[PDB]
Amino acid sequence: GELPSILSSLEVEGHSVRLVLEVAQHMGDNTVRCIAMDSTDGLVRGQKVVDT
Amino acid sequence: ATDLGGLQERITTTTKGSITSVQAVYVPADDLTDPAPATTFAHLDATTVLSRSIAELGIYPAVDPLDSTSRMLNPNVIGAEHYNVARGVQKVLQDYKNLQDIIA
Amino acid sequence: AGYVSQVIGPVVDVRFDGELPSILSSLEVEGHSVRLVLEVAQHMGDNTVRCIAMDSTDGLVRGQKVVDTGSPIKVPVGRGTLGRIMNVIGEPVDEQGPIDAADIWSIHREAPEFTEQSTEQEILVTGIKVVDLLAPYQRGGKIGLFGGAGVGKTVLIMELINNVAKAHGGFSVFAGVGERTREGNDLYREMIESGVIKLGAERGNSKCTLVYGQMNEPPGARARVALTGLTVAEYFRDIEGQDVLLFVDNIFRFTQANSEVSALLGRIPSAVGYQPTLATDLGGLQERITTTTKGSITSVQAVYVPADDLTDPAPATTFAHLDATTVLSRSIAELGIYPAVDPLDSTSRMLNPNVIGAEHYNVARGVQKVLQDYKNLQDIIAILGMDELSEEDKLTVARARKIQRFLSQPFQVAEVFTGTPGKYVDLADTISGF
Amino acid sequence: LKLPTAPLQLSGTSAQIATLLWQVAAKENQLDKVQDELYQFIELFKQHSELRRLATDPFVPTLVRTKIISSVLKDSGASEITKKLFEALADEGALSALLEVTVNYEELMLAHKK
Amino acid sequence: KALDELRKPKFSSKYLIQHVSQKLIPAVKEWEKSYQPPVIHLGRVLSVGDGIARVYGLKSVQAGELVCFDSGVKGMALNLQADHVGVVVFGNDSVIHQGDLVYRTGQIVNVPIGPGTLGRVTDGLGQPIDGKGPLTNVRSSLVEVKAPGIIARQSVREPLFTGVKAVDALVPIGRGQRELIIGDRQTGKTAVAIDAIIHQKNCNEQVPKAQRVYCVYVAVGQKRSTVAQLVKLFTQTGAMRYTIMVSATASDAAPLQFLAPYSGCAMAEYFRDTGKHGLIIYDDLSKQSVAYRQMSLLLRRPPGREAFPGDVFYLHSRLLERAAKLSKELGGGSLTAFPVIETQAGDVSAYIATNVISITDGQIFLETELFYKGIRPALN
Amino acid sequence: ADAKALDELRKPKFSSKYLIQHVSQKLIPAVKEWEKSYQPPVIHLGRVLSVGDGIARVYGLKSVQAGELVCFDSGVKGMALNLQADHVGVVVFGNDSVIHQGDLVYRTGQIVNVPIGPGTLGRVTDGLGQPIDGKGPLTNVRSSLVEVKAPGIIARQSVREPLFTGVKAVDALVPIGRGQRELIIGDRQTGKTAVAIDAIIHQKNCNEQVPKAQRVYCVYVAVGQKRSTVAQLVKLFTQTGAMRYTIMVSATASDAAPLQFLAPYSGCAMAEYFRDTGKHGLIIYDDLSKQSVAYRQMSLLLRRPPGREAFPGDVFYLHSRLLERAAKLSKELGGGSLTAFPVIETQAGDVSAYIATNVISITDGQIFLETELFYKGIRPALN
Amino acid sequence: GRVLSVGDGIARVYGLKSVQAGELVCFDSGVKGMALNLQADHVGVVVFGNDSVIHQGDLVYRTGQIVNVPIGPGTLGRVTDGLGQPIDGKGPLTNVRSSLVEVKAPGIIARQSVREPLFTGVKAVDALVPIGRGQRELIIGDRQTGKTAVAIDAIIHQKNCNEQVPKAQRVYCVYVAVGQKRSTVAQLVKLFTQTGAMRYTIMVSATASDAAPLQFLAPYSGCAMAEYFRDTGKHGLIIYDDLSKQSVAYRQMSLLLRRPPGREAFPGDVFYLHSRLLERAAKLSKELGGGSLTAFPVIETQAGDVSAYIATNVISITDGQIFLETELFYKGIRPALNVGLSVSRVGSAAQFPGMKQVAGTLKLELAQYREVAAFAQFGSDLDAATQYVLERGARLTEMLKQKQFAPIPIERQTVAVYAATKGFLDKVRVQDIVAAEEAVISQVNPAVFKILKANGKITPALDAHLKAELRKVKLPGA
Ligand SMILES: Nc1ncnc2c1ncn2[C@@H]1O[C@H](COP(=O)(O)OP(=O)(O)OP(=O)(O)O)[C@@H](O)[C@H]1O
Ligand SMILES: Nc1ncnc2c1ncn2[C@@H]1O[C@H](COP(=O)(O)OP(=O)(O)OP(=O)(O)O)[C@@H](O)[C@H]1O
Ligand SMILES: Nc1ncnc2c1ncn2[C@@H]1O[C@H](COP(=O)(O)OP(=O)(O)OP(=O)(O)O)[C@@H](O)[C@H]1O
Ligand SMILES: [Mg+2]
Ligand SMILES: [Mg+2]
Ligand SMILES: [Mg+2]
Secondary structure, rough: OOOOOOOOEEEOOOOOOOEEEEEEOOOOOOOOOEOOOOOOOEEEOOOOEEEE | HHHHHHHHHHOOOOOOOOOOOOOOOOOOOOOOOHHHHHHHHHOEEEEEOHHHHHHOOOOOOOOOOOOEOOOOOOOOHHHHHHHHHHHHHHHHHHHHHHHHHHHO | EEEEEEOOEEEEEEEEEEOOOOOOOEEEEEEOOOOOOEEEEOOOOOEEEEEEEOOOOOEEEEEOOOOOOOOOOOOOOOOOHHOOOEOOOOOOHHHHHOOOEEEEEEEEOOOOOOOEEOOOOOOOOOOOOOHHOOEEEEEEEEEOOOOOOOOOOHHHHHHHHHHHHHHHOOEEEEEEEEHHHHHHHHHHHHHHHOOOOOHHHHHHHOOEEEEEOOOOOOOOHOOOHHHHHHHHHHHHHHHOOOOOEEOOHHHHHHHHHHHHHHOOOOOOOOOOOOOOOOOHHHHHHHHOOOEEOEEEEEEEEEOOOOOOOOOOHHHHHHHOOOOOOOEOOOOOOOOOOOEEEOOOEEEEOOOOOOHHHHHHHHHHHHHHHHHHHHOOOOOHHHHHOOOOOOHHHHHHHHHHHHHHHHOOOOHHHHHHHHOOOOOOOOOHHHHOOO | OOOOOOOOOOOOOOOOHHHHHOOOOHHOOOOOHHHHHHHHHHHHHHHHHHHHHHHHHOOOOOOOHHHHHOOOOOOOOOOOOOOOHHHHOOOOHHHHHHHHHHHHHHHOOOOOOO | OOOOOOOOOOOOOOOOOHHHHHHOOOOOOOOOOOOOOOOOOEEEEOOOOOOOEEEEEEOOOOOOOOEEEEEOOEEEEEOOOOOOEEEEEOOHHHOOOOOEEEEEEEEEOOOEOHHHOOOOOOOOOOEOOOOOOOOOOOOEEEEEEEEEOOOOOOOOOOEEOOOOOOHHHHOOOOOOEEEEEOOOOOOOHHHHHHHHHHHHHHOOOOOHHHHHHEEEEEEEEEHHHHHHHHHHHHOOOOOOOHHHEEEEEOOOOOHHHHHHHHHHHHHHHHHOOOOEEEEEEEEOOOHHHHHHHHEEEEHHOOOOOOOOOOOOHHHHHHHHHHHOOOOOHHOOOOOEEEEEEOOOOOOOOOOOHHHHHHOEEEEEOHHHHHHHHOOOOOEE | OOOOOHHHOOOOOOOOOOOHHHHHOOHHHHHOOOOOOOOOOOOOOOEEEEOOEEEEEEOOOOOOOOEEEEEEEOOOEEEEEEEEEEEEEEEEEEEHOOOOOOOOEEEEEEHHHHHHHHHHHHOOOOOOOOOOOOOOOOOOOOOEEEEOOOOOOOOEEEOOOOOOOOOHHHHOOOOOOOOOOEEOOOOOOOHHHHHHHHHHHHHHHHOOOOOOOOOOOEEEEEEEEEEOHHHHHOOOOOHHHHHHHHHHEOOOOOOOOOHHHHHHHHHHHHHOOOOHHEEEEEEEEEEEEHHHHHHHHHHHHOOOOOOOOOOOOHHHHHHHHHHHOOOEHHHHHOOOEEEEEEEEOOOOOOOOOOHHHHHOOOOOOEEEEEEEHHHHOOOEEEE | OOOEEOOEEEEEEEEEOOOOOEEEEEOOOEEEEEEEEEEOOEEEEEEEHHHOOOOOOEEEEEEEEEEEEOHHHHHHOOOEEEOOOOOOOOOOOOOOOOOOOOOOOOOOOEOOOOOOOOOOOOHHHHHOOOOOOOOOEEEEEEEOOOOOHHHHHHHHHHHHHOOOOOOOOOEEEEEEEEEOOOOHHHHHHHHHHOOOOHHHEEEEEEOOOOOOOOOHHHHHHHHHHHHHHOOOOOEEEEEEHHHHHHHHHHHHHHHHHHOOOOOOOOOHHHHHHHHHOOOOOOOEEOOOOOOOOEEEEEEEEOOOOOOOHHHHHHOOOOEEEEEEEEHEEEHOOOEOOOOOOOOOOOHHHHHHHHOOOOOHHHHHHHHHHHHHHHHHHOOOOOOOHHHHHHHHHHHHHHHHOOOOOOOOHHHHHHHHHHHHHHOOOOOOOOOHHHHHHHHHHHHOHHHHHHHHHHHHOOHHHHHHHHHHHHHOOOOOOO
C-alpha cells in the first residue's frame, strides 16, 4: 500500500553497496517499475525496498 | 495486391458496355519500384509515365517517351506507318539518351 | 509416445505426456506416406517440443503418434557408404539396396576437444601444381572454391578425390547441401564414368560417399545434410584414422537453410537478414573439420558471394574459417589452361615461410611476382604494341607466358574423354621445376 | 438454442466465463446456489495447498490435474454447472482463474439484485 | 495472504471460452438432450477476415487438406494449431461468418489432369472458366507431388527450340531444364514465353507423336483482359490445341494465386510422367510469392526478409524442381519450366529474384535500355 | 475485475459449507492415488519450464540472486539473468541440448565467478575458468567475480611506465603506456593477432631481467576463434616459454554464445588479480568484434529490440564496462596496472562501423593495420 | 475513472464508460488529459503535462468536451501554449471564444479559386514561387537553411502591408512553434515586438520540454485560432514550424499507446495527421465570407533526402514546395531557394501582374543558366552566346539574394527584376549587384512605386517612363 510517486528514489536494504532505485512507471497491480543507479547483481526477489 | 486487384478488375469492358478508365497513379518519391505503382503497372493497358527530368527541361506534358508503354503499340493494330514512326522516335531518343552521357 | 500438437508448415509441435526428448533428438511419425523424421529444436514448456521436419508435413494430423528414438539422427556410416548416395536421414537414394553400415552414428557431435587437437599445420599435398605451389591446402583446413559453371570445377573435385584417395589413402565425402537435382545427377554420373564411384560388386572399391540434400527438401532437411556428410567423414577420421576430404557444396546454402530454419522457429533475424545464430551455426559445422591425433578432415567448400559483396555476413563469417581460397575463373579457362585456378586471386594462409619453408615460399612468391608484373602491362601491350616493350620486360613476358602454361596439368579422371593421361605431380617436383 | 441476457456487459476471457456461468445458472434457477459454492472453492484454496497446486504448478500433468477435480466433486452440492465447470477449468489449467471469475460473477449478481 | 498466486491467472489458449462453453451448455438439463457441437470432422468459424478463417474443431483435419464451408466456398487447412485451425479461403470471405460450419473434405488439394485439359482455360484449382463445360477426359491428381529424385532423372540433351534467335543461339534451352525469364516491367518476358509456345505448335505438326511438346501457361496475378487476349491469340494461332492455361487472376483470392503454379505443374506433369514432353511457363512467379506472403502474414507466421516467410525458398524450389528430364525407365518424359520474375530497376539482388536465380539453371535477362535501343527481344 | 473488489474476497462470505467438508475428506485419498505422477514440489531449487535457443526458463529458485551462477542437474552451468515474478531466465554456459523440461536447477549461491590466482598461470581455461589443457584442475587459486566494477577516478593515476611491445612500428610510433587500452583494428588477415603475440613474447623476454615487480603477466582471451588456432597458439607459447606468464582463456567458434560473451570478463577477472595485487597485467581480447556478435545473438534470442546493424544498444556498455577495468591504479591501491589490447576486425577497411566506433570511443588509442600496406609486404602494416 | 497504470505520459484508466474518443479528461492532481484509446477494459489517456503527479488509483473525471482552444481576436499578440493557455504572463485571454481543434475541413462547395496574392516579401519567393491566399506552401529544407527565415519574413511583411491596405484585406498571422526551445521562441516574440508584427500575430508554442500530446496538438490548436479569421471574412496565415517535429511527438504517443509501428516507426495514420490539418487552409467562397487561410508547413530533411517518409507525405499534400539547399546556402545564395525543385501549383494566376510579366522570363533565363553552368564547371569551352546566358544568369542569382530581416514590398521587387531582365544591370560587375540595387531603389523616385502598386501592372505610360528613369541612376562601376 501507498505506492511512491514517479521519479521518487527508493533504497534497497541488504545490498552490498548503496542501491538507489528511481521510480519510472506504475505498472498497475501495486507494482512500480524502477531504474537502478548501481548494478543489480545480488538482488533477490523478496528484498526490502524502502521509499524515501 | 489483392485489394488493388479487387478494385481494378471491376473496371472492365463487358459484353454489355465499356468503361474507358484513366487513373492517375502517384509514385511516392519519383520511385516506380515502390510496391503500390509496381502493383498498378500490371493492371493497365497503357501506362503514361511522367518524369521529373522532362518537366525540369520545360517540356510539358512531361511524359517519359521511353518509359511509357501501351498494348496498342503493335503493327497489326494501329498499322505499320504509326508503329514504325513510334519505334523510330523511341530509337532516336534512346540514342540521344546514350549520347547525352558523352556530350555533357 | 508423443503426439502432434501443431503443424505450422515445416514446424511441428509434439506433445509428450511422458518424458520429453532431448533437444536435437530425432522423432519418427507413425503413419505417413513417406517416413517423416522430426528433429527436436526446443522445449516449449507444457510438455511440448518444437520440431523441424526433414520431409513434407502435408497430411499430418494433430494427434498422430510420434515415436522418440532417444538419440539424434543416426546415419549409416563406414566403408559401406562409399559410392552410395545417402540423404540427410541416412536412407539410400541411389536405389541400390540398403547401405551396409559398419556403424550408426548420431549426426550431432561436439568438436574435437582441445587436447585432441593437433598443433602441426602442414600441407595436404594434392598433386595439382597450382594448388600445391601458389595456394597450398592445409591438412585439416577449410578451402574456399570460387568456381562456377564451365570452369572445370567438377573435374577438379573428382581429381582431388582421386588424388587424395590414391596418394594419402583417405576417402572423400560429398555433401550436396541444397543441390539442384539435375546437377546432383550430373555429378553422380560423372563420378560413375570417371572411376571415383563404382557400382554393383565393385562398390567397395569406390572412393567417395555422396550425401545429397536437394533444393526441394524442406529447410530443416538441407540444413542438416552437411552434418550427415560430416559424420560420414568423422567415422573415417576417428575410427579408420584417415585423411578425409569433405566437399560441402555451397556452404552459402547451408547458411541459407539455417537462416530459414531460424526464421520458421520464430527467431528475430540479425544483420542483413540472417539468423542470430549465424556464427554459431557456422562454427558448429566448421569446428568439426580439423586435424585430430587419429586423422584429419579437410574441406573444399564452394563459396557463394551474395550481392558480389564480400562484406555480407554470410561470406564474412565463412571466410573467418577458410584457410585457403581456390578461385576458378573463366579467363584462365578460355585460355585453355586446366585447372582454371587463378594464380593471383587464389590465396592461402599456409603460404608463409614458417610453415612451408623459405624455398617453397620464395618460389611461390616469385611465380606470383612474375605473373603479377606481367598482368599489369597488358594495358600497354594493346595501346602501344607487343614489340614496343623493353628487352627486360619481354623476358618477363616470355617467362610468365611459359609459367602460366606450366600451371596447367592433365587430370587422371579426365582421360576417359580427353585421351591424354593424367599426371600426378609431387611437391618437390613442383618446387624444383618452377 | 437460446440463453438469457446478461444484466451488464463486461470484460473478456475471465469475465466472459463468468457471463456464461451466470447465463446457465439463470436457466437452472440456482443463481445464488452457484455463487456460494464459488465462495467455498476460494475457501478451499485457502486451507489446502494440494488444491492450489492444481492451479499454480505448471508441472502437474493435465490428466492428474483433471482427475483430482472430478474425484472430489461427486454429487454433494454438485449443481452440475459448478461441477462441469471445474473439469473445464482443470482441462486447461485455468483453475487459477477462479479468483477472477467470481469477482465478475458478483458484479453480475447485484445487477440482477437491482 | 496466501492467495496472491491465484490473483493473476494465465491461460495457454485464447479460446478458453470455447471449451467451457462446450462443457457448460450441455450441463444445463434442458439442452443436455442432444445439443453438443461436434468437433472431429466439423468445425465452427471463430474469426474470419482477410481471407483467413480461424476454425475451432476439425480435430481430424490434415495439414494442407481442403475444407468446405457452409456456403460452398472451399478452403485449405494451413495452420493446424493446438486449439484452432488456420484456414485460408479460396474465395471472398464475405460469405463466411462467425459460427459457420466447416466440413472437412478429407482430401488434400486436387486438380484434374489428363488429356481433357488441353485447350481449356482453367482457374488456379482446375475449374474451367472459358464457359465450355466441365472437364471430361481427365483424372484427379494431387497438387503438391514430390519432385523426381536423382535416379529418376537423366541428363538434358535434346533441345527445346524457343523460336527466338537470341535464345536458340546464345542461351540454349534443353528439354528438362528450368530457365528463368527475368527483367523489368514491359521488357518482353511474356513475349519470349508466348514465342516458345507458338513455336511448339509449329513444331508439333512436323515431328512424331513422342517428340511433341505440350505447353502449359500459368497466368498468376494477371488481369482477365490480358488472359482473354492471350487465349484469343492462342486460338487465332492454333496453339490452343496443345496448350493448357491456368489463370488465377488479380481478383482471385491469394490462395488461388499461390496454388495456381502448383496446379499448372500438376497438369503439366501428366505429360512428363507418361513419356511425353511438357513446357510450363509460370508467368509472374513474383506475384505468386506476393500472394503467399499475404497468406503467411495474415496467418501471423514470423516474417523474414521483405516480409516473406522462412519457406518461400522452399515454395519456389519444390515448385521448380518438378521440371525434370526423366530416365528411360520412367518413360523418358520431360518438363521444361520458364519461371518469369519481374525485377524492379534491374535489382536482381532482390529476395525472390535471388531465390529463383539460385533454383533455376540459366536465366534470360531482358534489359529495358536494350529494349528501347531497338533490340527486341532485349536479351542482355 | 478490481483489486479492492478482489481483496474483499479474501474474507469468508459463504456461511454454507456443504462442499468444504465434502472434499476436505476426499482430497487426500485422491492425492495419494496420483502420487507417483507428481514431480516433487520445488521452491528453493529450480525446475526447467522450457529450454530453447540457449535460454532456460526456470520455475522456482525463490532466492537466487540476479546474475547468479546456477547449476543444472546435467552439470552444465547457467546464469540467472532476469528474475521474473513466476520464472527465472537462465542463459546456459554450454550446449542446451543436455537440458530438458523438468530438470532440477541447483543454485550455487554465488554470482558468476571464475578461479583467479597464481595457479591459473600457465593454464588454458575455457570461458568459465574450467581448464581444457588436460593437466588437471586449477590448484592454488581462488574464485572471484567476473562482473566487478572498474576502479573509480580516485583509485587511478596517470600512466608513466612504458610496457614495451617488442614491435618496432608500435614501440616507435604508437607507444603503449602501462595501464593503457590500445585497440588493434584492421581487416581480416592483416596481422592483428601477430602484434599481440609479439607483445606477449616480448613480455616473456623482459620478465627474465626485471626485479620481480615490473613483471607483466599476460592473459590471452581467444573469443570466437577456431580451436586449431588456439591449439597452435598454445603450442607457440610453450615453444617460446611464454606460457609461464600467460593465461589462455578460450571460448572458440563452436562454444555457446554465453561462453563467448563471458570469456572476456573471465579473462579480465583473471588479469585483475595481477592488477589488484601491485603486479602488472596485459590482456588481449582477441576479436572483441566476435564477443559483440555472440552478445547480439544472446540479445536477439531474448527477443530484445535490435538497434544499429542489429545490435542491442547496450553493446556499447558490453565493451565499455569490460575495457574500463584496464586501469593504472594509485599508490595506495598497490600501483598495479592492467593493459588491454582489444582486437576489432573491420570489413573492407570501414572503421566507421558500429562496434569499431564504439571501441574507438572507449580505448585510449588505435593501431590501424591496413590491408594495402599488408599486401605490399610492409608488415606490421601500421597505418 | 481510476488510474490503472501510469508511465511515460500515458495513463491507463479503468472506468469512464461514457467518455468520448478525443475527449478532454481531468485528473485529480489537476493535470489534463485526452482519451485516445477507448478499449473495452481501459482508456488510454495521454497526459497534458508531467505524469509524475499521477499515481495508481487516482481519480479521473471526464469533462464531457472534446479538446478545444480559445479562438478570437483576443489571441493576437499573445504567446499561448500548446492548447490555448497563455504563457507570456499578460493575464487571461480576454475577448475570446472556445472552439474545437479537430474541425472538418471546408468542402468543395465551400471553396473558391485562389486568385489574390499573398506577398512574402522574399523576392526569390514572390517571383518564381508565387503564393496565393488560400494555398498551402511547404518550406522544406535541410537542417540550418533559411526555413524559418522565409517564415519570419512573411510575417514581418504582413505588418508592412496591413498598415497600407483597407481593413478587409489584412492578413493576421499565426506562428506555431512545435518542439523548439523556449529560448528560440523568446527571440521571436522579441523580434515580432521590435518590428511591430506582434500586433497581427498569435504565437502558439509547444516547446521541447512540453508533453508529446501538446506538441502533437499545437498545430491543430493554432489552426483553430487562425480559422477564426478565415471563417469571418478576414485573411489568416499560419506557419507550422517543424511539422516534422509534430510527427515525432505523434509517434511517441502512438508507440506508447501500443499502436503498432510502420515506416521508420511511424503510425499508419501519419499521412492523415498532416492532411487533416493542411486541408483546413482554404480560400472560402463569398457565401462563407471569402476568408482565406494560407499555410506554411515547415519540414526538415536530413541530408537533403526529400524521399523521407514524412517529407513525401507533405510534398503530396501541399500545393507548392520551397526547397532550400545547404550547398546553395554556403555559395552566398540567401534565401537558399532551389529554383529547379521549387513549385507553386497555383502558378502565376495568383501573383502580382506587375511581376507576372517580368518574372516569367526570369524563371526562363535561370533555367538556361543552370544548364550552361553544369558544363562550364568542367572548363571546356565558351561560345559568346552560351556565355551570355552564363553572364545574365549570374546577374539574376545575385539579384534574387536578400538579407535577413528586411522584406521588400512588391513593387521595389519587380522594379529590381525589371532592372535585371531588361539589361539595365549589365556592365555592372557580378560581385556588387547586391550593392547595385540599393542604388536602383534609392535614386529612382518613389512616385513610380505608387503608380506600380496602384495599377498593379507596368502600363506603357509607366513602362517607358520606368526605363527612362532606369538610365538616370548611378550604378557602381558603370
Ligand atoms: N520481339 C518484340 N518486338 C517488338 N515488340 C515487342 C517484342 N516483344 C515484346 N514487345 C512489346 O513489348 C511490350 C511488353 O511486352 P510483354 O508484355 O511481352 O512484356 P512483359 O515484361 O510481360 O510486360 P508486363 O510485365 O507488363 O506483362 C508489348 O507492348 C509488346 O508489344
Ligand atoms: N610482421 C609480420 N611479418 C610477416 N608476416 C606476418 C607478420 N605478421 C603477420 N604475418 C602473417 O600474416 C598472417 C596473418 O597474421 P595474423 O593471424 O596475425 O592476422 P589476423 O589479423 O589475426 O588475421 P585473422 O584475424 O583473420 O586470423 C599470418 O599467417 C602471418 O604469417
Ligand atoms: N536570407 C538570409 N540571409 C542571411 N542569413 C540568413 C538568411 N536566412 C537565414 N540566415 C541565417 O541562417 C541561419 C539559419 O536560419 P534559420 O533560423 O531559418 O534556420 P532553420 O532552417 O530554422 O534551422 P533550424 O531548423 O535548425 O532552426 C540563421 O542563423 C540565420 O542568421
Ligand atoms: Mg507479361
Ligand atoms: Mg586474429
Ligand atoms: Mg527554424
